[PDB]
């Protein structure tokens, strides 16, 4: 019943992505990712120590790290132009104001929002990776259900309880373009030797994460 994702602050995922994006070289980008992956695997073993048929895996993080491969969640229905409006309303921005204009007259959108949010209010987030996923789930469902009001509420929960850095990264997760500077093939290859292969055949991110959870146990076993 318990999940590693329920114990990991979204902020630690985001600070990892930030250091990855910020690294110049491939080796450094890999090192930041590997560190988070390795901790996740150590914690998984401590958490699920004496448990039976465990289905928990790295999927709740991996689906945020490779969001373009997201298949379980339907489309979010979220455009950068409407996030702009959501922030102007939420932050009580005057539309003649400098921050409002930056958002309206839209180095992606995530970065603009980031510069706007950085000097403001909340500096430390509270959400776990699981809670972020549960909320992205509501957003996707409510897009299918054609409930734009419930989408705004869920998004508002995600945004208001998160730091600027988390919001930058959340935005990129929703748009499905992290701009990390490391390929999907590289990410898969750090995770597991066989992961790129398994994903080719299954097109199934959760299956890959769960079946190849143990780096020393290959597809052939």
């Amino acid at each position: 019943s318990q999940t590693v994702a329920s114990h990991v602050p979204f902020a630690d995922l985001c600070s990892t992505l930030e250091r990855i994006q910020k690294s110049k070289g491939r080796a450094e980008k890999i090192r930041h990712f590997r560190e988070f992956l390795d901790s996740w695997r150590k914690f998984h073993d401590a958490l699920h120590k004496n448990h039976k048929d465990v289905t928990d895996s790295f999927y709740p993080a991996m689906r945020l790290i490779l969001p373009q491969l997201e298949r379980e969640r339907m489309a979010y229905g979220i455009k950068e132009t409407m996030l702009a409006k959501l922030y102007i309303e939420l932050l009580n921005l005057p539309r003649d104001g400098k921050d409002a204009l930056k958002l309206l007259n839209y180095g992606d959108f995530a970065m603009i929002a980031y510069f706007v949010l950085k000097p403001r209010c909340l500096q430390k987030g509270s959400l776990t990776i699981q809670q972020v996923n549960d909320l992205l789930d509501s957003i996707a469902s409510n897009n299918s259900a054609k409930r734009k009001d419930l989408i705004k509420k869920s998004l508002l929960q995600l945004i208001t309880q998160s730091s600027a850095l988390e919001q930058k990264w959340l935005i990129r997760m929703i748009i499905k373009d992290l701009k990390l500077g490391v390929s999907q093939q590289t990410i898969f290859s750090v995770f597991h030797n066989d992961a790129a292969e398994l994903h080719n055949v299954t097109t199934d991110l959760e299956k890959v994460c769960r079946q190849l959870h143990d780096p020393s146990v290959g597809l052939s076993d």
Binding site: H7, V8, P9, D12, S39, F43, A46, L47
Partner: peptide
């Protein structure tokens, strides 16, 4: 016996 994430990463 519940592990704290902070002694694994944070």
């Amino acid at each position: 016996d519940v592990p704290q994430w902070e002694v694994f990463f944070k």
